Amino acid sequence: QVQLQQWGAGLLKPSETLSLTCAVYGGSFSGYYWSWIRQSPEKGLEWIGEINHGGYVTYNPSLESRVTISVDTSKNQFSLKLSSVTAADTAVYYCARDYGPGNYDWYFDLWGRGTLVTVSSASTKGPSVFPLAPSSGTAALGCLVKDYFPEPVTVSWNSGALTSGVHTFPAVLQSSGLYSLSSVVTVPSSSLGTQTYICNVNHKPSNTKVDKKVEPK
Amino acid sequence: QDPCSNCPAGTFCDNNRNQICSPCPPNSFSSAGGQRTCDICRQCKGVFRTRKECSSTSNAECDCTPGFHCLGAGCSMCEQDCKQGQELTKKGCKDCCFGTFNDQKRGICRPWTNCSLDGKSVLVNGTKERDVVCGPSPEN
Amino acid sequence: EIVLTQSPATLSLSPGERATLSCRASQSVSSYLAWYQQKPGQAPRLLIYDASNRATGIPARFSGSGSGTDFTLTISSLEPEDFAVYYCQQRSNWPPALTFGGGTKVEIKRTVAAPSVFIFPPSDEQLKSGTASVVCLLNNFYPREAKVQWKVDNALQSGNSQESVTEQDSKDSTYSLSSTLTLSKADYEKHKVYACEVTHQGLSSPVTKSFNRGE
Ligand SMILES: *[C@@H]1O[C@H](CO[C@@H]2O[C@@H](C)[C@@H](O)[C@@H](O)[C@@H]2O)[C@@H](O[C@@H]2O[C@H](CO)[C@@H](O[C@@H]3O[C@H](CO)[C@@H](O)[C@H](O)[C@@H]3O)[C@H](O)[C@H]2NC(C)=O)[C@H](O[C@@H]2O[C@@H](C)[C@@H](O)[C@@H](O)[C@@H]2O)[C@H]1NC(C)=O
């Protein structure tokens, strides 16, 4: 019953420095190598480097020039520092323990939960919420949350009431550096003037909550 | 399996860095693959002299200083050079007695070949520095 | 470095069938190869190490084989839990390298389902901002592939749309897609008919859904 907790900054501007820390709970720290691995939707899974109790390090060559991995043997903590970050370094960073059956520790048997790190020059902003009104036997309506930074943003329908027909779409980063997504729900065309439909959008990074009513045109 | 077999000569399998094959530090070599630590280059100083300098793959090879000749296997001890026609023995080095010779700056004196025993003449009589060269056998 | 290439990119199979995934190394990696499964939002989980051995918590239907440059991961009988992305991983000391594959998504095979299309005209609120957002919705379709093109007064729009698509639904194993055309209010008011045409295997012919800017 060993387990890893990680934490650190999740939103950086370019040229700044990524810093993250992993803590091992419930086992020894010396017998193992401890790795940092990141996962990009562009560049996929990529190993960054590893360290042991002795502070012996190996780095991925593609990164060695800006990486540092260090260890704090008094708290069973190792930590990653990546300098001069760029939009390319946006990814989920994992800590992990190396495992191998033989005289090599060459796979990964235990993983942190992951810490998503975003880098962007965009300054923080709140969503404009616009409606997607239906017409007239199934109808469809929804909300368009637009021009917000950074992630995340939550979107509920009818303060949690309506869940069945909902599809919330993954946000997409526009050329401005701002995200946009749309939520939609299919409802019976009968219930269109009867039942009233409201989408509640929460964007905690800007302290913005918005409830917009979708009424037929 | 065991992946240190993968590491060539010139590198060692680093047990601190998870069996990666890093090259050998300065003044050090590994002559085979698979080694977990590199070996220290022999240094040739004083009585000895560096013949082949040491690489990452190969040790250094030591000659013996002028006037001396390598004695043992791998030039480990180092003995002195008498001249051609002499033999160093107990108490220093002396010329070879008549009828004996030594063609090298090393070693003992051997007696001349006796040509008469194979029915052979003596084409050139021996010195202290060369053996007798025998003539044609009387079976021709 | 050494590069691992998985194939096919994605795999569509019905539950209870047998999944066979492949990994090809650019040079030999002996048997120092592992397989991981990754479910959405979770860390990868080690399944197979040393090309052919299960890790501790892995059930019997998982199996690995291969040595050298060609490795296969076999799931003997797919179960709902097993529909995820599978990655392979290799390590070498000569030359030093640690790399993963690009992944193989294993997807639930369904019968084809034509989309339900809906177009949405820009909100009057938004047109005060100076930008217009037209939105096409394709609802509950399979397979994931679908061509969606915008026609504005019969002219075909190019670099101003962004698509976006949900993960396979939990219950019915379908996808949903959303095309969002964005023009400036000025450019939006020069034109009358805003049409979205959708081509999909499930449809006998494309379906167009449009509106006039007046109404
Ligand atoms: C080769 O050695 C010969 C003697 O060695 C013997 O023969 C050889 C082949 C081999 O079998 C050995 O085991 C033998 O020991 C040389 O011949 C000798 O020459 C010396 C003089 O150079 C002579 O000594 C004496 O000289 C005094 C002079 O004061 C005189 O009073 C004596 O009577 C006597 O002559 C040896 O007798 C003689 N030995 C023999 C067996 O003949 C030989 O020298 C050459 O050959 C002889 C025949 C003469 O013509 C010499 O002038 C000549 O140098 C050696 N060969 C060479 C090319 O040097």
CATH number of the domain enclosing B132: 2.10.50.10
Q: Pairing between strand A11-12 and A115-119?
A: parallel
Same domain? For C120 and C78 the reply is: no
- Provide CB contacts within 8 A for A155, sequence distance 6+: A143, A145, A168, A181, A183, A199, A200, A201, A202
- Residue C208 CB coordination number (10 Å): 13
* Nearest partner of C191 among C159, C155, C148, C149, judged by Cα: C155
- Kind of pairing, strands C10-13 and C104-108? parallel
Q: Residues A23, A10: one domain?
A: yes
Closest by Cα among B72, A130, A119, B59 to C131: A130
**Of C93, C110, C127, which one is at a domain's C-terminal end?**
C110
Instruction: Tell if the CB–CB gap between C34 and A107 is shorter than 8 Å.
Output: yes
Q: Which residues contact A175 (CB under 8 A, 6 or more apart)?
A: none
Indicate if B78 and B49 belong to the same structural domain: no
DSSP H/E element including C188: helix C185-188
Measured in angstroms, the CA of B3 and the nearest CA of chain A are apart by 7
Nearest CA in chain A to C122: A132
| Residue A69 sits in the same domain as residue A138 | no
Looking at the structure, do residues B109 and B131 belong to the same domain, yes or no? yes
For the CA of B116, the nearest atom of ligand 1 = 11
Same-domain status, B1 and B70: no
For B94-123, b where at least 16 C-beta lie within 10 A, e where not — what string?
A: eebeeebbbeebeeebeebbebeeeebeee
Q: Are A83 and A66 in contact (CB under 8 A)?
A: yes
A87 and A133 together in one domain: no
Residues A99, A160, single domain; the answer is no
- For residue A196, the SS3 value is coil
* One domain, residues A52 and A146: no
* Domain boundary residue, one of B12, B41, B64: B64
Q: How many structural domains does chain C have?
A: 2
Half-sphere exposure of B41 (CA within 13 A, CB side): 22
Nearest CA to ligand 1 atom 45: B125
Residue nearest to atom 14 of ligand 1 (CA): B125
**What is the best residue among B125, B131, B133, B134 to mutate for testing ligand 1's pocket, by most ligand atoms within 8 Å of CB?**
B125
The structure tokens listed for C178 are 């959303």
- Is residue C82 within 8 Å of residue C106, measured between CB atoms? yes
Alpha carbons C176 and C115: distance in angstroms, whole number: 8
Cα separation, C33 vs C50, whole angstroms: 5
Q: Is there a single domain that holds both residue B42 and residue B26?
A: yes
Alpha helices, H only, chain B: none
Q: Which residues form the domain of C193?
A: 111-215
State the structure-solving technique: X-ray
Q: Which domain holds residue A141?
A: 122-217
> What CATH number corresponds to the domain at position C39?
2.60.40.10
What distance in Å separates residue B28's CA from the closest CA in chain C?
20
Kind and range of the H or E run holding A203: strand A198-203
Q: Which atom of ligand 1 is nearest to the CA of B121?
A: 9
DSSP letter for A170, please: P
Which of B45, B64, B83 is at the close of a domain?
A: B64
Is B125 near ligand 1, meaning CB less than 6 Å away? Answer: yes
Do B6 and C92 count as a contact with CB atoms less than 8 A apart?
yes
Question: Does residue A127 share a domain with residue A117?
Answer: no
End residue of a domain, out of C69, C94, C110: C110
- Looking at the fold, whether B71 and B137 belong to one and the same domain comes out as yes
Amino acid in the structure at residue B88: L
Whether residue B60 is found in the same domain as residue B91: no
| Residue range(s) defining the domain that contains residue B84 | 65-140
Q: Using the 3D structure, point to which of A96, A121, A146 is the last residue of a domain.
A: A121
Between the alpha carbon of residue C11 and those of residues C19, C98, C104, C143, C153, the distances in Å are 8, 26, 7, 12, 40
Q: Is B6 helix (H, G, I), strand (E, B) or coil?
A: helix
State the Cα–Cα distance between residues C114 and C174, nearest whole angstrom. Answer: 10
Contact (Cβ atoms closer than 8 angstroms) between residue C32 and residue B3:
yes
By C-alpha distance, which of A34, A146, A49 is closest to A98? A34
**Are B78 and B124 members of one domain?**
yes
3 state SS for B22-55: EECCCCEECCCCCCCCCEECCCCCCCEEEEECCC
Which of A89, A121, A153 terminates a domain? The answer is A121
Task: Report the residue from B1, B3, B18 with minimal CB separation from A50.
Answer: B18
CA of residue B99 to ligand 1 center, whole Å: 14
C5 and C41 in a common domain: yes
In the beta sheet, which residues pair with residue B14?
B20
Question: Which partners does chain C have (≥3 C-beta pairs < 8 Å)?
Answer: A, B
Residue pair A103/A91 in contact by the 8 Å Cβ criterion: no
Cα–Cα distance measured from residue C122 to residue C152, given in angstroms and rounded to the nearest whole number: 14
Atom 17 (ligand 1): residue with closest C-alpha?
B125
For residue B113, the CA-to-ligand 1 centroid distance in Å is: 18
Q: Which residue of A has its CA nearest to B5?
A: A103
- C79 and C140 inside one domain: no
Which one-letter DSSP state was computed for residue A192?
Answer: G
Q: b or e along C127-138 (b: 16 or more beta carbons within 10 Å of the residue's beta carbon)?
A: beeebbbbbbbb
State which of C83, C110, C137 marks the end of a domain: C110
Residue type at A88 in one-letter notation: A
| Distance from C-alpha of A82 to C-alpha of A37, rounded to nearest angstrom | 12
Query: Which residues on C lie below 8 Å from A155 (Cβ)?
Result: none
When divided into structural domains, chain A yields a total of: 2
d(CA C143, CA C12) in angstroms, rounded, equals: 9
Tokens coding A143: 């909300």
Mark which of B17, B38, B64 sits at the end of a domain: B64
Three-state DSSP class for B59?
coil
Q: Are residues B70 and B124 in the same domain?
A: yes
